[PDB]
Amino acid sequence: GPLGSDDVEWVVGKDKPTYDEIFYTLSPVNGKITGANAKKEMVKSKLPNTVLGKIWKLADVDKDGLLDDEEFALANHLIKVKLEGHELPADLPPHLVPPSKRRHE
C-alpha cells in the first residue's frame, strides 16, 4: 500500500461539524443544498454582492450550482472568517481544494 501518500489536510474539516449543523438546517437533499439557502446565509453575514460572488467562486470549484456539505463548509468558513475581520486572497490554494475535486500537476 501507499505509506508516503502526499495528502494535504483540508483546513475546512476542522470546523465542519458547525457548518454541518448549519447545512442541515437549510434542508439538505442528498448531501447538497440549494443556492437559495446559501444565498440566505451569505446575505445574513452582510457581505457585499461582489464578495458574495467571490465566496461562491472559491467555494464551488466545479460550479455545480449546488453546494455539497463539503462545499458549503468551505463557503461558510470563508464567510465567518470575513466576519472575523480577515480578508480573502480570492485564489484557491491546494489545501483549500476539496480532496475529491483537486488535482496536482
Binding site: 443556492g35 444565498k39 458574495l52
Partner: peptide, 12 residues
Amino acid sequence: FNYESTGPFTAK
C-alpha cells in the same frame, strides 16, 4: 422565474 448565470450571486 428564478434563473442564475454562474451562481445565485453573479446574476445580471
